[PDB]
Design a protein around this ligand. Structure first.
Ligand SMILES: CCCCCCCCCCCCCCCCCC(=O)OC[C@H](COP(=O)([O-])OCC(O)COP(=O)([O-])OC[C@@H](COC(=O)CCCCCCCCCCCCCCCCC)OC(=O)CCCCCCCCCCCCCCCCC)OC(=O)CCCCCCCCCCCCCCCCC
Ligand SMILES: CCCCCCCCCCCCCCCCCC(=O)OC[C@H](COP(=O)([O-])OCC(O)COP(=O)([O-])OC[C@@H](COC(=O)CCCCCCCCCCCCCCCCC)OC(=O)CCCCCCCCCCCCCCCCC)OC(=O)CCCCCCCCCCCCCCCCC
Ligand SMILES: CCCCCCCCCCCCCCCCC[C@@H](O)O[C@H](CO[C@H](O)CCCCCCCCCCCCCCC)COP(=O)(O)OCC[N+](C)(C)C
Ligand SMILES: CCCCCCCCCCCCCCCCC[C@@H](O)O[C@H](CO[C@H](O)CCCCCCCCCCCCCCC)COP(=O)(O)OCC[N+](C)(C)C
Ligand SMILES: CCCCCCCCCCCCCCCCC[C@@H](O)O[C@H](CO[C@H](O)CCCCCCCCCCCCCCC)COP(=O)(O)OCC[N+](C)(C)C
Ligand SMILES: CCCCCCCC/C=C\CCCCCCCC(=O)OC[C@H](COP(=O)(O)OCCN)OC(=O)CCCCCCC/C=C\CCCCCCCC
Ligand SMILES: CCCCCCCC/C=C\CCCCCCCC(=O)OC[C@H](COP(=O)(O)OCCN)OC(=O)CCCCCCC/C=C\CCCCCCCC
Ligand SMILES: CCCCCCCC/C=C\CCCCCCCC(=O)OC[C@H](COP(=O)(O)OCCN)OC(=O)CCCCCCC/C=C\CCCCCCCC
Ligand SMILES: CCCCCCCC/C=C\CCCCCCCC(=O)OC[C@H](COP(=O)(O)OCCN)OC(=O)CCCCCCC/C=C\CCCCCCCC
Lengths: 53, 104, 459, 329, 56, 64, 121, 54, 175
């Protein structure tokens, strides 16, 4: 059981996440983009309510 | 093997039950003294002197030499607080107040 | 999930049709096999969950508890083999039936995609434990203990049920998935305050909370060894699992409502740790230590941060294993001396050295020595609490100091010093007892190699 | 790759082989203490090589070999720091332990459990080597607690003696009082710097606040037996004389001072904590020398001398001279 | 001895048969939750030349 | 046996609600709770006011 | 839902004719299996109370208990399914005939709905 | 240990509940079996029902 | 080594001084490292050659899984559970990728600090600014969602921040 748990396949996607982050950093560094962004969602697809107060 | 009459009971009010309680704890009626009858659940239990076990004679042949106790004697309410591994009350060469003043 | 439930059900016909002298062997073998089968639920996902069907689902909070629950039954059988030797075959089979029923209820409780199904099984666990305590307990107080252990629980659990059905009348569902995805903020109202209290108090009484912890020393001191093992290892963790599950619909009211429980826990952990210092009973001392650890778990769940949840999961698993081991060691002493008083049998390291080594390892892991998972959970909870407020460090440090103090006090009182002269019936420790201690302790030190398996869904 | 890296890890690894063989047949014979002594001598002569390499060029490394759990943005790994302090202290500690074990084969000859004594001595040495070379706070805490447990086990070596058990519990109590500050420091550093790693802690703290340094100072005071927390070191003379010579004299008790040495880039930016360290060291050295000059037990006199020397080390730290404090160690 | 130990060791076979039955029941219950097989936005895939269902 | 029984099981039948007992119970069982509640509530109110004002400097504070 | 006065209800009819429009429960229905299990438990308790070998005293009696439980359970399951089908039929018809009481709400996405954010601190 | 855990925390929840339920049970069950009193109570509750719920 | 990308984990050119012995006295370091090479580096290399050729006799591959883009929580109706599930899973994957990005930048920072020696305060300012920027962005995205975080809570936090920013900008324009 200990051997089985030790060799459990990476279904939590840690290696996948690191590879995705590596390629994303490689792209953003080369293209001059500001690494991570402050907005998690695209502001253009958010309709804010006007206050007009 | 202990009967119902050999367990601690309520605070003794009369000299007869006081003597009976002193008999229960294998100690003299004169030497027996319960804790003061307040809300605390001391009930009928001897209030032995507040000395630590470090003050007991180390040259006497105790039945429990490390704890310095005999088999049938009454046990202090706070025995586990005085076990030579913990707080002791042995007299010191200098008075407690004098030591407190100097250290302070 | 039926690949675990069906073999557990088949444990009953196999037990009742066994030979008079083959019940323990067969039960132990097949319980170990069921544990091995259940060990394959540890393969969890970083995505949602392992949603097997409409009725049962698995989580990385559920899977460690399920594995611990399955692993506990063989150990309970080994521990119960000794004091039930002079017992009739029918009553031994009934005891094993109670143990199997309790495992089945716990396994279905931990998966239980529904909150009403969770409540039903969460309360179904109450019956076999009550029978075990009130039937195969030695003292005359067992009945009283059972009464306490019952009514306390129901005192918290009937309001929860009401709240539960109320929620389904407004939300329309009690499925954990729909409840989580469709959660809406809880307004700061009197009705919502009482709904919050109804949702919380049932799991709070079972941890137990410091104010409501009186049933636990009674139940543990009065129960047989297997009852104590399952109470300390699994049944206390039902409250933590339930609180982690249900606090998703209690926001943002938890911020205000958590203050009394946080104060009760942070002060009562100090209180119960200090109580452990003056205790003449081993089982009572271990029970109070359990109360302190579960107070820390309550603080973790109420703070409700990722590090809090990870630490709470790790501490629940670690405490289950450690407390079960401590109860087993105390019971090995009791089966020789028949007293259960700590000061009576002394200097046992000179007479039983390997069992003294087991005592030392159990005390070290209760003391939260790094890099044990006990300290991993402790440290994660402490860091989360420090972020919550920097003044909590005072109470956490005091609790750590007092914990080390009473753990080493319990070790030194029983194992060190001079042996009691008039006790001459202390036999060499059996292979069964040594194997029981090893099967408790090796899983802990193996889990410290792979901590992410017990750090929960927020890892 | 570079030899320097391999040698540092081999010393620590071959220190553990007798512990693995503790269940073998050699542990049942009378040749086990000599086996342990020979192992320690070989480790010392092997560790002399990285010292020569550093003395020649000043080679410095960090070895993060095993990745242990990762906590969202916080990564925990088994990492060893092989700076000047580590590569200088390891040979000295190994040499002292070699001499102490050779002395013990004569001092503890009549002890029935002499193999267990040597096994115990080796376990303490392993935990101290873990403490010294740690690159992050969790590994350093592992060594911190391991040396404490080993001291508890070795002080109460004669467990039928009440005073030995009292002294062992005393040492545990005072070291937990220091551990409060250690855990405070870990919590602060994780909450604010997002790391227990030393490199990130140094990078992100250009002006370190009071609280983490005060926690570090409390831990150092606890483990080096400074004035508030001093009595456990003289009380620890209950253990056998080799235990007094190895642990409570020259290797384990300097650990607290070493901690303040390990964090000296942050200490030099804070005047208040520096002043507190200086004053604590001064009062400790004076008070313990004053107690020493009138004692009648020889081991007590030497223990009070040790405590005064530790106070002098704290004074040196307080005047912002960490390398000189290491040299004194 | 065959046909004698069977009457005495027959109980052992029950736990494994229960496990096999539970595995079969898990598959059977799985078979009734295929409303979105090869229909999620994430894994919408074209079938292979000799594939009927993407999972079972 | 008498020692353990007196320490454990003879307490409540010999309990009497007394001004001394009532005041000590109330103090030792309620006062610490309210003291700690006041301390933590004041601390968290100060922290919340600072974070609303923006003058807290939570840089590099990623893990909570 | 009081369906006692529902129109066109034959008074003492266990299963109406329209219930034949519904799929019958399968013979391997888990609820039928549970009813058979209940009959088996009744047989075991019958053997136990009469002080007979519990598992192997009367096979004909246990078979009869299991069979009767399965028979009644099948018919009970049919009636249960029929009643739930009536409930759903009536509810859908009522919603259809009362459109003003069950309006079609406007579709709004989360990107254009403002939900209050409550930080956890 | 004694003041809070053995006395007051015991007094508050379990002991108070036991005392209250015991007194309520002793009050309710203690009827001497005299149907005179039963039917007098019946008349009182009948008039109360007539004067209270309409 | 080719096992990692040099761009994601950059290193300086690593200039190394040349030995300039001022004396004819034989040093121990060169002789000792020569015997270390002979006794350790050579057999280890032989064993590695054997293992690598055994591996080369049996060459097989594994792939990095690709996930397409799904509509996010902003494009999901108020109660539509299927799109909410898809958006939540996508958001969780993006959250973990962000965690790994922060980890990469932190590794850069630690390596720079160790590498630069006594000059780390001046020679690691670039990595410090990179970590400052990435930490600010990550904290803006995820700092206070707590346990039971979700894409909806992250969207609500972003919306609240956007209202504050718009109000401040309108005040500044009209001030
Ligand atoms: C340090 C590295 C060592 C590597 C060698 C491999 C060791 C494998 C051990 C595995 C775990 C032990 C199993 C528990 C049961 C004990 C076995 C037994 O029955 O004894 C009979 C056996 C036969 O002797 P006997 O004469 O017949 O018995 C007479 C009596 O029993 C009387 O017996 P005694 O008087 O000789 O005492 C028994 C002994 C054994 O009893 C014990 O107490 C052992 C358990 C200690 C742990 C306490 C819990 C705290 C949680 C820590 C978690 C660590 C686990 C790591 C992963 C484990 C994987 C399963 O107790 C001690 O000696 C006291 C030791 C105190 C240790 C405190 C230091 C803890 C931290 C150390 C660092 C760990 C991580 C390093 C990370 C950084 C560097 C990489 O004796 C032994 O074999 C002794 C065991 C060796 C001592 C263990 C101390 C070091 C091992 C730590 C765990 C593994 C470290 C991995 C890192 C490797 C690099
Ligand atoms: C979650 C759902 C899933 C699980 C379902 C659980 C329920 C199912 C069964 C329900 C009831 C039916 C059976 C009960 C009748 C009682 C008979 C009895 O006494 O046992 C003796 C009998 C053997 O002894 P005997 O020599 O014939 O005569 C002895 C006398 O009967 C009397 O012996 P004695 O006079 O020498 O000894 C006196 C003893 C006798 O007293 C008793 O035996 C008590 C009987 C149990 C009460 C039944 C209550 C009604 C159902 C309640 C279920 C509660 C569940 C809810 C959770 C709450 C938990 C309490 O009484 C005492 O000692 C007093 C102290 C007891 C302590 C406090 C009482 C606690 C009892 C609670 C038990 C609850 C579970 C019982 C499980 C079945 C036990 C046999 O045991 C059996 O063999 C019957 C067990 C079933 C046979 C299974 C055969 C199938 C195997 C092959 C097929 C494989 C299946 C898969 C097919 C595919 C494979 C290829
Ligand atoms: C007497 C003295 C000893 C004599 C013998 C000497 C030798 C001692 C050496 C052993 C101890 C030293 C520690 C060295 C550790 C080496 C093994 C370690 O590296 O493996 C770990 C693996 O260990 C397991 O992960 C942890 C053990 C599993 C625990 C499960 C418990 C068993 C089930 C029983 C039920 C218990 C219920 C508990 C409730 C949860 C971590 O591996 P990992 O770096 O990750 O990756 C593995 C390889 N990959 C990359 C291909 C995946
Ligand atoms: C015993 C062992 C442990 C058991 C578990 C103990 C934990 C339960 C504690 C309950 C948590 C607190 C309850 C209510 C908290 C809300 C805050 C409120 O009480 O304080 C003020 C409320 O003012 C007063 O407190 C009003 C209530 C006074 C009456 C309560 C009795 C006070 C002592 C009784 C304690 C007994 C508890 C156990 C009962 C069996 C706030 O001022 P206000 O802005 O206006 O109200 C805001 C809330 N609104 C918006 C919903 C209205
Ligand atoms: C408590 C456990 C169940 C015990 C029940 C007894 C079991 C033995 C009964 C044997 C079968 C009885 C059925 C009688 C045959 C035909 C009946 C038919 O003519 O009457 C119909 C009526 O059918 C019966 O009412 C249904 C009986 C089914 C009872 C079982 C339900 C129990 C709840 C589920 C618990 C699990 C029990 C399953 C194991 C037995 C039409 O009645 P109707 O004139 O139009 O309305 C009058 C009644 N109203 C006013 C209430 C509406
Ligand atoms: C705050 C900490 C509060 C202290 C906790 C007290 C815990 C009480 C229970 C302990 C159990 C009893 C016990 O251990 O026995 C006492 C035992 C036996 O006495 P011996 O001197 O060894 O006599 C042997 C010869 N016959 O000795 C002890 O260990 C007692 C230790 C108590 C220390 C408490 C005082 C600590 C105060 C430290 C304040 C200074 C802090 C340092 C500041 C540093 C800032 C940079
Ligand atoms: C007994 C009577 C309890 C009185 C409490 C009243 C609470 C209440 O009614 O709230 C109802 C509330 C919603 O309000 P509405 O009436 O539906 O509409 C209001 C808006 N128009 O619904 C609920 O949340 C029901 C939840 C159960 C209420 C709690 C009852 C018990 C008290 C709370 C639990 C705390 C005690 C637990 C004891 C622990 C002992 C170990
Ligand atoms: C030894 C027997 C075999 C001898 C011949 C082979 C020689 C070694 C060659 C093996 C190849 C190396 C190898 O095993 O791979 C790494 C392999 C694990 O696989 P990874 O994928 O790298 O780790 C998971 C995270 N990525 O490394 C190992 O685990 C073995 C050695 C690592 C150190 C052992 C653990 C020691 C510490 C014990 C626990 C201490 C507490 C936790 C650490 C706290 C630090 C904060
Ligand atoms: C509205 C009404 C609510 C009623 C709630 C009832 C709670 C359940 C407890 C019922 C106990 C009442 C009966 C009782 O205690 O009798 C006294 C009885 C005497 O013992 P006997 O065997 O009957 O005979 C003695 C003479 N030979 O005393 C006892 O033994 C009690 C021992 C067990 C105590 C159980 C404690 C249960 C209460 C815990 C807290 C929760 C209570 C429920 C409401 C809580 C409020 C949220």
């Amino acid at each position: 059981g200990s051997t089985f748990v030790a060799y459990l396949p990476d279904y939590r996607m840690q290696e996948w996440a690191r590879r995705e982050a590596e390629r994303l950093v490689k792209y953003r560094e080369a293209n001059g983009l500001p690494l991570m962004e402050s907005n998690c969602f695209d502001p253009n697809k958010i309709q804010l309510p006007e206050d007009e107060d | 093997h202990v009967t119902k009459d050999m367990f601690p009971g309520p605070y003794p009010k009369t000299p007869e039950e006081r003597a009976a309680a002193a008999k229960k704890y294998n100690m003299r009626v004169e030497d027996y003294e319960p804790y003061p009858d307040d809300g605390m659940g001391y009930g009928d239990y001897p209030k032995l002197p507040d000395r630590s076990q470090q003050e007991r004679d180390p040259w006497y042949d105790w039945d429990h030499p490390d704890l310095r106790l005999n088999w049938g004697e009454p046990i202090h309410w706070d025995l586990d607080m005085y076990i030579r591994n913990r707080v002791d009350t042995s007299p010191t060469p200098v008075s407690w107040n004098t030591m407190c003043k100097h250290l302070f | 999930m039926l690949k675990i439930i069906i073999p557990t059900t088949m444990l009953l016909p196999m037990t009742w049709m066994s030979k008079h002298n083959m019940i323990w062997i067969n039960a132990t073998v097949h319980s170990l096999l069921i544990s091995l089968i259940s060990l394959s639920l540890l393969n969890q996902l970083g995505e949602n969950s392992l949603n097997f069907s409409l009725t049962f689902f698995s989580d990385s909070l559920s899977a460690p508890l399920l594995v611990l629950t399955t692993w506990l039954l063989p150990l309970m059988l080994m521990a119960s083999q000794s004091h039930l030797s002079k017992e009739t075959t029918t009553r031994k089979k009934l005891y094993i039936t109670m143990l199997i029923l309790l495992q089945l209820f716990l396994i279905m409780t931990f998966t239980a995609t529904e909150l009403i199904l969770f409540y039903i099984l969460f309360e179904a666990t109450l019956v076999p434990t009550l029978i075990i305590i009130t039937r195969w307990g030695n003292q005359t107080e067992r009945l009283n203990a059972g009464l306490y252990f019952l009514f306390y629980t129901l005192a918290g659990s009937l309001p929860l049920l009401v709240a539960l059905v109320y929620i389904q009348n407004t939300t329309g569902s009690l499925n954990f998935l729909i409840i989580h995805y469709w959660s809406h903020p809880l307004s700061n109202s009197w009705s919502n305050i009482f709904m919050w209290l109804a949702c919380i108090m049932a799991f709070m009484v079972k941890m137990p909370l410091y104010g409501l912890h009186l049933w636990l020393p009674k139940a543990h001191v009065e129960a047989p060894i297997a009852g104590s093992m399952v109470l300390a290892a699994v049944l206390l963790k039902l409250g933590g699992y339930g609180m982690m599950r249900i606090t998703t619909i209690l926001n943002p009211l938890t911020n205000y409502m958590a203050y009394p429980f946080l104060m009760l826990s942070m002060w009562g952990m100090i209180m119960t740790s200090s109580i452990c210092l003056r205790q003449t009973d081993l089982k009572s001392l271990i029970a109070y230590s359990s109360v302190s650890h579960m107070a820390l778990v309550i603080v973790a769940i109420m703070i409700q941060t990722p590090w809090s949840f990870m630490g709470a999961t790790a501490l629940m698993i670690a405490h289950g294993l450690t407390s079960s081991m401590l109860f087993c060691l105390a019971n090995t002493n009791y089966e020789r001396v028949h007293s259960r008083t700590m000061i009576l049998a002394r200097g046992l390291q000179t007479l039983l050295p390997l069992m003294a080594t087991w005592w030392l390892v159990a005390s070290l892991t209760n003391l939260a020595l790094p890099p044990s998972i006990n300290l991993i959970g402790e440290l994660f909870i402490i860091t989360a609490s420090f972020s919550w407020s920097n003044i909590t460090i005072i109470l956490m440090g005091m609790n750590m100091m007092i914990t080390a103090l009473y753990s080493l006090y319990m070790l030194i009182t029983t194992q060190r010093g001079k042996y009691t002269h008039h006790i001459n019936n202390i036999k060499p420790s059996f292979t069964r007892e040594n194997a029981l201690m090893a099967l408790h302790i090796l899983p802990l030190l193996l889990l410290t190699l792979n901590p992410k398996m017990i750090l929960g869904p927020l890892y | 790759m570079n030899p320097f890296a391999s040698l540092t890890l081999t010393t620590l690894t071959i220190l553990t082989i007798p512990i693995m063989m503790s269940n073998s047949n050699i542990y049942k014979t009378n040749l086990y203490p000599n086996y342990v002594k020979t192992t320690v001598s070989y480790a010392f002569t092997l560790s002399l090589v990285p010292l020569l390499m550093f003395m020649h060029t000043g080679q410095e490394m960090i070895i993060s070999n095993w990745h242990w759990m990762t906590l969202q943005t916080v990564e925990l790994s088994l990492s060893f720091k092989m700076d000047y302090f580590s590569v200088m202290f390891i040979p000295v500690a190994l040499f002292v332990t070699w001499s102490i074990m050779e002395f013990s084969m004569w001092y503890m000859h009549s002890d029935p459990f002499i193999n267990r004594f040597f096994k115990y001595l080796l376990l303490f040495l392993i935990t101290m080597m873990i403490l010294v070379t740690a690159n992050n706070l969790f590994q350093l805490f592992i060594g911190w607690e391991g040396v404490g447990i080993m001291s508890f086990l070795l002080i109460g070596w004669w467990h039928g003696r009440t005073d030995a058990n009292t002294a062992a519990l005393q040492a545990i109590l005072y070291n937990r009082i220091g551990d409060i500050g250690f855990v405070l420091s870990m919590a602060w550093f994780l909450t604010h710097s997002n790391a227990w790693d030393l490199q990130q802690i140094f990078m992100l703290n250009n002006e370190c606040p009071n609280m983490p340094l005060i926690g570090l100072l409390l831990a150092a005071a606890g483990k080096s037996a400074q004035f508030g927390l001093h009595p456990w070191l003289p009380s620890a003379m209950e253990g056998p004389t080799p235990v007094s010579a190895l642990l409570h004299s020259s290797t384990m008790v300097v650990a607290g001072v070493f901690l303040l040495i390990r964090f000296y880039p942050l200490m030099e930016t804070n005047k208040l904590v520096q002043t507190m360290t200086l004053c604590l060291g001064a009062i400790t050295t004076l008070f313990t020398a004053l107690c020493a000059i009138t004692q009648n037990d020889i081991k007590k006199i030497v223990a009070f001398s040790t405590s005064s020397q530790l106070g002098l080390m704290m004074v040196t730290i307080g005047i912002n001279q960490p390398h000189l404090a290491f040299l004194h160690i | 001895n065959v046909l004698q130990i069977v009457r005495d060791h027959w109980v052992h076979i029950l736990v494994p048969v229960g496990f096999v039955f539970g595995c079969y029941l898990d598959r059977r219950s799985d078979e009734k939750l295929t409303a979105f097989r090869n229909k999620s936005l994430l894994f919408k895939r074209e079938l292979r030349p000799n594939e009927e269902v993407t999972w079972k | 046996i008498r020692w353990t029984y007196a320490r454990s099981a003879n307490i409540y039948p010999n309990f009497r609600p007394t001004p001394k007992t009532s005041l000590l119970g109330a103090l030792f069982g309620i006062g610490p709770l309210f003291f700690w509640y006041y301390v933590f509530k004041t601390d968290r109110d100060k922290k919340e006011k600072l974070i609303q004002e923006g003058k807290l400097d939570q840089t590099f504070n990623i893990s909570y | 839902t009081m369906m006692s006065g529902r129109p066109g209800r034959v008074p003492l009819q266990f299963l109406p004719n329209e219930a034949r429009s519904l799929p019958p429960p399968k013979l391997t229905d888990p609820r039928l299996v549970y009813m058979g299990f209940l009959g088996y438990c009744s047989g075991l308790i019958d053997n136990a109370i009469r002080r007979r070998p519990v598992v192997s005293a009367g096979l004909h009696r246990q078979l009869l208990y299991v069979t009767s439980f399965v028979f009644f359970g099948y018919y009970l399951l049919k009636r249960q399914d029929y009643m739930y089908a009536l409930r759903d039929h009536d509810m859908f018809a009522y919603v259809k005939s009362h459109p003003e009481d069950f309006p079609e709400k406007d579709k709004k996405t989360y990107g254009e709905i403002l939900e209050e954010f409550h930080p956890v601190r | 240990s004694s003041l809070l855990d053995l006395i007051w925390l015991e007094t508050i929840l379990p002991k108070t509940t036991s005392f209250i339920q015991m007194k309520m049970s002793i009050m309710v069950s203690n009827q001497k079996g005299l149907i005179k009193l039963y039917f007098l109570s019946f008349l009182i509750t009948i008039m109360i029902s007539m004067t209270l719920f309409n | 080594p080719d096992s990692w990308d040099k761009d994601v984990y950059p290193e300086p050119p690593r200039r190394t001084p040349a030995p300039a012995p001022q004396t004819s006295l034989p040093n121990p370091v060169t002789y000792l490292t020569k015997i270390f090479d002979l006794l350790v580096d050579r057999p280890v290399t032989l064993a590695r050659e054997f293992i690598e050729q055994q591996h080369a006799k049996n060459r097989y591959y594994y792939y990095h899984r690709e996930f397409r883009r799904v509509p996010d929580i902003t494009e999901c109706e108020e109660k539509d559970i299927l799109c909410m599930f898809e958006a939540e899973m996508q958001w969780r994957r993006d959250y973990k990728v962000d965690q790994e990005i922060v980890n990469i930048i932190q590794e850069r920072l630690k390596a720079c600090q160790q590498r630069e020696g006594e000059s780390y305060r001046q020679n690691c300012a670039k990595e410090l600014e990179q970590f400052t920027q990435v930490s600010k962005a990550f904290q803006d995205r995820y700092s206070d969602l707590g346990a039971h975080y979700s894409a909806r809570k992250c969207l609500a936090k972003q919306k609240q921040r956007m209202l504050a920013e718009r109000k401040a900008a309108k005040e500044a324009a009209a001030a």
